[PDB]
Amino acid sequence: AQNPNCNIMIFHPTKEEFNDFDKYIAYMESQGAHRAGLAKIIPPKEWKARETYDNISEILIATPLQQVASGRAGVFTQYHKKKKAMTVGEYRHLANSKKYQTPPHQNFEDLERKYWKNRIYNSPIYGADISGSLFDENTKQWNLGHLGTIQDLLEKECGVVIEGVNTPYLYFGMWKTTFAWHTEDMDLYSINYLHLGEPKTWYVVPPEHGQRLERLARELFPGSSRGCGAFLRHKVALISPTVLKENGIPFNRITQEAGEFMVTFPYGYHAGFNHGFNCAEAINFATPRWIDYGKMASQCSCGEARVTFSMDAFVRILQPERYDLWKRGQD
Numbered sequence: 056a057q058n059p060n061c062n063i064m065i066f067h068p069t070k071e072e073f074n075d076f077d078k079y080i081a082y083m084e085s086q087g088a089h090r091a092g093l094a095k096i097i098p099p100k101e102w103k104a105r106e107t108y109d110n111i112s113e114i115l116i117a118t119p120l121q122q123v124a125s126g127r128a129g130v131f132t133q134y135h136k137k138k139k140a141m142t143v144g145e146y147r148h149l150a151n152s153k154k155y156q157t158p159p160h161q162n163f164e165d166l167e168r169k170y171w172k173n174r175i176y177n178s179p180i181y182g183a184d185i186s187g188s189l190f191d192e193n194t195k196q197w198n199l200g201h202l203g204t205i206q207d208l209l210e211k212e213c214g215v216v217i218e219g220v221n222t223p224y225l226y227f228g229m230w231k232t233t234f235a236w237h238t239e240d241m242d243l244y245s246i247n248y249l250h251l252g253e254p255k256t257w258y259v260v261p262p263e264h265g266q267r268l269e270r271l272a273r274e275l276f277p278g279s280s281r282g283c284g285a286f287l288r289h290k291v292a293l294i295s296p297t298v299l300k301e302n303g304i305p306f307n308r309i310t311q312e313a314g315e316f317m318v319t320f321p322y323g324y325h326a327g328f329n330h331g332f333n334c335a336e337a338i339n340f341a342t343p344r345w346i347d348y349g350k351m352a353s354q355c356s357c358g359e360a361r362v363t364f365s366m367d368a369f370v371r372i373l374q375p376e377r378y379d380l381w382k383r384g385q386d
């Protein structure tokens with residue numbers, strides 16, 4: 056078995072190898088990459104997502120989110136308070152203000168220490184989940200707006216044609232902006248490209264050990280656990296590496312820099328934070344190997360998780376017994 060310790064693997068495809076996206080995913084899996092839950096892909100040196108980022112300041116962040124924490128430094132939840140709209144140029148200035156800027160630090164490890172020590176005492180503002188793309192239309196390789204759609208994958212594998220579309224999302228971050236512990240909707244893959252700015256640190260649990268994280272989360276968030284049988288689908292809970300190590304949960308960490316891709320694999324729990332002002336683009340995708348994970352994916356039916364139009368068909372076809380109850384949650 057390849058990669059039996061479930062380490063995060065880093066790949067350096069040549070420009071020739073960067074042509075065929077599906078084939079490269081299947082190659083990474085042949086080397087065991089999926090066992091970690093997360094992989095890094097450094098694009099060939101000839102490749103570019105677009106020519107420059109010089110003209111992005113007029114993109115609108117219609118609903119910036121202020122991420123307010125409750126709990127203790129290593130075990131907390133966050134809620135998102137909606138703020139007034141602002142442009143990316145306004146948000147960048149805010150991120151660089153004395154109130155919100157990255158503190159002085161020695162290296163990524165010192166910054167990580169400061170994040171875990173101090174995150175809860177601040178409320179950074181995140182421009183998340185903005186439909187759109189920063190890939191130039193002429194970029195032919197690994198263009199996250201030109202991938203094969205999950206609806207077409209389901210149709211190719213299972214023969215059933217379904218409604219729904221699959222488009223990317225932009226994320227504008229600042230120091231301490233946080234993504235809570237989660238897997239993707241329907242335990243899909245994700246791919247994330249860091250277009251510009253400061254790094255993003257990731258934490259991940261191997262898929263084969265995801266239920267260990269879930270059991271710890273039920274112990275640490277006991278009221279949330281009683282409220283919903285899949286409350287990590289709310290995307291609000293944080294647990295530090297120190298707490299994970301104290302409780303024997305297997306995980307790995309890695310920092311993504313501008314110009315790098317990350318891939319998350321089905322049922323790979325992940326969480327992380329941004330080091331300073333940045334912009335990422337991400338989208339879900341599927342392969343044949345995903346279908347069995349989609350069939351088994353947990354669902355939130357309490358009503359909190361509230362997700363896309365396109366998830367309907369996935370539940371209806373892959374999880375017909377759950378369909379009924381899950382849709383009660385969504386309406």
Ligand SMILES: O=C(O)CNC(=O)C(=O)O
Nearest residue numbers: 226234245246247335337
């Ligand atoms: O970048 C972020 O805030 C969160 N992204 C992801 O969870 C992802 O790409 O799967």
Ligand SMILES: [Mg+2]
Nearest residue numbers: 111112113114
């Ligand atoms: Mg603009």
Ligand code: NI
Nearest residue numbers: 238239245319
């Ligand atoms: Ni994710």
Ligand SMILES: [Zn+2]
Nearest residue numbers: 283355357359
């Ligand atoms: Zn729920």
